[PDB]
Amino acid sequence: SNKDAALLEAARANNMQEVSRLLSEGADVNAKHRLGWTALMVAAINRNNSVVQVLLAAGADPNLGSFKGCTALHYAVLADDYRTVKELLDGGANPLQRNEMGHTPLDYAREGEVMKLLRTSEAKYQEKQRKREAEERRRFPLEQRLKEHIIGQESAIATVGAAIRRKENGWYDEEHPLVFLFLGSSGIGKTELAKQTAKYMHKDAKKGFIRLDMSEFQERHEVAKFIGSPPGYVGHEEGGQLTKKLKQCPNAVVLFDEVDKAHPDVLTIMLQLFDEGRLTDGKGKTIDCKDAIFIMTSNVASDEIAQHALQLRQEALETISKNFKENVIRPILKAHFRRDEFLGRINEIVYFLPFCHSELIQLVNKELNFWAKRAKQRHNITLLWDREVADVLVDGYNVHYGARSIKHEVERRVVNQLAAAYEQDLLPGGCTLRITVEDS
Amino acid sequence: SNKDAALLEAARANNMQEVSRLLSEGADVNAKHRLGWTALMVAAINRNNSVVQVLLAAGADPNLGSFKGCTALHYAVLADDYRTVKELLDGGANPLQRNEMGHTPLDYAREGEVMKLLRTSEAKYQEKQRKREAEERRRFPLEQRLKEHIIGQESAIATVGAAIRRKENGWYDEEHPLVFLFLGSSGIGKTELAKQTAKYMHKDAKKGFIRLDMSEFQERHEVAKFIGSPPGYVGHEEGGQLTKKLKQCPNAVVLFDEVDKAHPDVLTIMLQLFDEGRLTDGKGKTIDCKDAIFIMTSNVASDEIAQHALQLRQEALENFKENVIRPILKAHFRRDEFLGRINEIVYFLPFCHSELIQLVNKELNFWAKRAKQRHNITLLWDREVADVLVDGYNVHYGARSIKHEVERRVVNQLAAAYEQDLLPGGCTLRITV
Amino acid sequence: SNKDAALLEAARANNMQEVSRLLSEGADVNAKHRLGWTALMVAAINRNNSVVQVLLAAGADPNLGSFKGCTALHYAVLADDYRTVKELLDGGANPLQRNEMGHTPLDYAREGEVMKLLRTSEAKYQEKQRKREAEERRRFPLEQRLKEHIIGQESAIATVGAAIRRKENGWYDEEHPLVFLFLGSSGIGKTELAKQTAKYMHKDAKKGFIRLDMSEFQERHEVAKFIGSPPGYVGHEEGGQLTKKLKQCPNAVVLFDEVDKAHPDVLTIMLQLFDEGRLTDGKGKTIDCKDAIFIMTSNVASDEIAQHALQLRQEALENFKENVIRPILKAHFRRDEFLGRINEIVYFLPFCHSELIQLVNKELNFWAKRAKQRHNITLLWDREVADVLVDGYNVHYGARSIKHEVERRVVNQLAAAYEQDLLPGGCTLRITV
Ligand SMILES: Nc1ncnc2c1ncn2[C@@H]1O[C@H](COP(=O)(O)OP(=O)(O)OP(O)(O)=S)[C@@H](O)[C@H]1O
Ligand SMILES: Nc1ncnc2c1ncn2[C@@H]1O[C@H](COP(=O)(O)OP(=O)(O)O)[C@@H](O)[C@H]1O
Ligand SMILES: [Mg+2]
């Protein structure tokens, strides 16, 4: 504890020797004084450029929070010393950091070298971040990330990626959220695509992905879950759940899984959300989510979508459907979703088509790779197969389930055999299996 | 208040006599000083090994939470004293516990004895966890207990054991919960089998088993009873039966009795739950049930199984390609989702004569061993009277029916004799009726 | 604190004047010193027999808890003063109570009169226990006990007595809760039998009785009353109506006064009462009901007995047990859970002419003795007046009909006569109609 006080006193007195001795002895570089200032901070206010430099080289943090709450950069600007401001900025100081009073390094000092340094640091940071992010996106676009997991559905991936890129590059109106409606048969990756998109946007934030299941909303009064009860009713003080989640992460990705299962008057609450990204809870607080992304998944027109997809498979063949027939898909949606204004607010309608033979083979290969890696990681068993296995597994495909049919087929026909053999201790650790078309 | 302050001062001053006197008087061992540290904490920072020893022996907690938020172990490490750290760890201190600033004892530990001791404690905890897992794996197979407590239903026992073992050994996507559909006549061990399974996995916890009878869930408004009402509606505070119980034990075993009677909108929530393993209560709290086990029971095809009896009376009385059960079930549900998601289908067969006499022998043995008027024990039941008790065939009502049968002409006579003081020392049950 | 310290010092020094002054001033007789010894304790260890006497006369407790945890009896016995030990025991001190170290006063006692006195007190306690056991044994036959205050319903009384004996004698599924369903019209002794049973079984005052009207329990009141509004719910009435009383008497006789009016939610939560009991309280407490007695009642089956009268006319007076198995009850209350778990069903028969006239006679006797100027009571033609009263036979809602008959045809006439000053003494009755 004495080391921190000694370092603070040395920094206040501009004692280079004492500051260096304390730092080399393990003294807290960001030591805090009882008055609320640190060694780097009091060095900054006292125009101790050398002390500030040595403290920064020792690991001083200039962004740590009357001048109460003013950081090291704030005090450097207060002294109107440009050398200290430049050194702190080179050390990672934020030129726009704020104190308890809200003052910033860009306000304390008069126009001059300090302002120039702060502005240049801010501009260079912003430009570097912009260029780096753009280059990263170019190098590894969203489409490749989705293709890592999603198989087929090229049109849907292209549409979603185009919309997302248009949003990220700033070429989007901020007055209206972006809304998607995923349509297609069951078990073809709609909610999977939504999950992948949410992960891409908010990879390191669970709060960034808000999931709803509209099976849990199959009656009119279920709207009270979204915004909570009005004043004087049970649960009022709680407030809306969806409103809470949106307030936590305004730019999150909201997924209304199986929206078709909602009562139609539950969708009415979505009008303001989809138009202006505005929603009011039971307490009257209004949530602004203009930059959020809304995804709705349903299979309302599944049969018609499959029939259309046959168009590609109806070709004389001597892949991409124009799908102007959406004019006759609209009546189905209107019949289910009874309000035209609801559909009008949807930016894009994404159609997922049934898998082709090659896509089915790819799915089977994906499943067998997953199982092989699981076996290697768990029991250290190598697992291998040929075309005959993929084709035999595909032959058991069911249209009504898609990827789920493939999963069940692989599990039943192959995984059961691996489990039975393992339980019989016929699989020594490190051994290799070929599935030599093990059938019938 | 004076006792706590005196204990804190004595611990800070390494005064064994004062600390011992305060502990004997009844001073709080975990007393907290106004500066944020306890007596154990200050004894630790001051390298008061003996004070730490006496405090821990009296019940001091070293895991209680600049050095703000530092625990007793944190303070001992900060003092770089091996003795205090060792004593606190022996008292249950966690070497990886984080203070309010996110610094663990390992972080504060300088390389040397303290670091090695903290790593040794961490290794001890990890090895204890690994040994617990190894014992859990190596313990008796579930099928053993099933056979111990279940009579007959060998096919069901084998299927359930195989499924559970496969799940345990991997070989099963953990992203989706196991879903079982139990078919067959009622009162033949379905619920007993589920309880035993719940016993295998949660022998030490009753909460591991949950029941719902879908005779409660036959109309649209009963969906709100399943997962809670919306906020501002009747019963919102209750939050629904299913979620209220699952939130206590996500990896429990859930038994849905007579899913046939479930209203379609309830069938929709169950299928959603099975597919995802994810459910929201009415209060907005979400529950993850990926590793849970869901068991559905019904008698939709009980008659077909009983009459066909493709194993009972035909192959084994303890694949048959019972291909009619699939269309029978399809006729009763949304076959696309309902039957697609089911992981396994388990058949229960009616009891046989051998199973019935085994059950009667087990009931008579339960009555005989529990004879608290001990000296009348060895009231031995010969053989043929147990066969006559089986001859009161009540399989329609299930095993408990046979239990009642036995109790009637096996317990009433014992109670009458005892009340009459007629039969000290016990007797053979011999022949009656 | 000053009064407590002064009283403790006076007791230590055997200062009778100071002790009396402090006691008269309101000083805590059981004042406890910071070292763990009270005024009575220090008076006892110092052989201050007079101080102990005056403290006990003032309400000192000699059972108040290394001598840590030692009672005043322990200290008096340690001092080896016969008078002090005798005085403390006279106040209720237990000669076998253990201190925090597990040492009883007998262990501290030295050979002499102290041994004899402590053993005499222990023998007194043992004799009290044996006397209670003998009284409970003499309570049998419980059928006579009930008949002392009940008329008719011999079959139900005998059934209840036999069940009680079986459970006591180990001839019952004691692991499972004990539950009766009582069936018949209203006002035919159901509540009267439940109350008499509670009065007899429980020592006195029916402290262990718990009766509730399930008609007030609905979806808006189920948890708020049955479980009792738990914390965080609308209302804080934890326990509410049932489990607030079960906290004291786990083996309560608990009456539910109409399951026909009980809500499905409360009938489901009542499923906890069976299996193991352990019904959840609003405070979270659960009571093992394996020993409890539950008495559900209903009038929905009231016709099953009254419409026949064979269960009454053909029960060895001059029909069969479960003539029809749960005729209406299974369809109404979901026998699978609610009634399947009920151990026994008790029928209640319509009152006979002899029973009705006996009720009339007892009520008339009560009114006669209830008279303040009993000299005017002659009860001439009391039997004939009862014959007239029974004309309004109880066939509507129970014995309350006969009570109203008596009130109308007797009490009003007597009140009118008294108002007319026609009741000087030695007054006969009057035969109306
Ligand atoms: N196109 C796909 N490519 C690779 N995996 C897929 C694909 N589609 C689905 N899957 C996988 O198969 C499962 C199906 O999940 P979903 O994506 O959610 O199905 P779904 O289309 O969204 O439709 P529902 O809700 O049954 S209507 C997931 O396990 C996916 O991981
Ligand atoms: N070995 C056994 N086999 C079958 N049932 C048993 C066995 N032991 C006890 N039982 C009884 O079987 C019942 C188990 O639940 P059960 O009634 O058979 O399922 P369900 O009612 O849904 O058809 C219990 O009442 C239990 O007492
Ligand atoms: Mg989906």
UniProtKB/Swiss-Prot annotation, chain A:
ATP binds at H149, I151, S186, G187, I188, G189, K190, T191, E258, N299, R345, R404. Its EC number is 3.6.1.-. Changing A375V: In MGCA7B; loss of ATP hydrolysis activity; loss of ATP-dependent protein disaggregase activity. The keyword Repeat applies. It is found in: Mitochondrion intermembrane space. Disaggregase activity is inhibited by ADP. It catalyses: ATP + H2O = ADP + phosphate + H(+). ANK repeats lie at residues 2-31, 35-64, 68-98, 101-130. The modification N6-acetyllysine is found at K373. The keyword Transferase does not apply. Homododecamer when substrate-bound; the homododecamer consists of 2 homohexamers stacked head-to-head via ANK repeat-mediated interactions. The active substrate-bound form is likely to exist in a dynamic equilibrium between homohexamers and homododecamers. Homotetradecamer in the unbound state which is remodeled upon substrate binding into the homododecamer. Interacts with PHB and PHB2. Interacts with MAVS; the interaction is enhanced by Sendai virus infection. Functions as a regulatory ATPase and participates in secretion/protein trafficking process. Has ATP-dependent protein disaggregase activity and is required to maintain the solubility of key mitochondrial proteins. Involved in mitochondrial-mediated antiviral innate immunity, activates RIG-I-mediated signal transduction and production of IFNB1 and pro-inflammatory cytokine IL6. Plays a role in granulocyte differentiation. Belongs to the ClpA/ClpB family. Hexamers display robustness and can tolerate some mutant subunits without loss of activity. This is Mitochondrial disaggregase. It comes from Homo sapiens (Human). The lineage of its organism: Eukaryota, Metazoa, Chordata, Craniata, Vertebrata. The gene is CLPB.
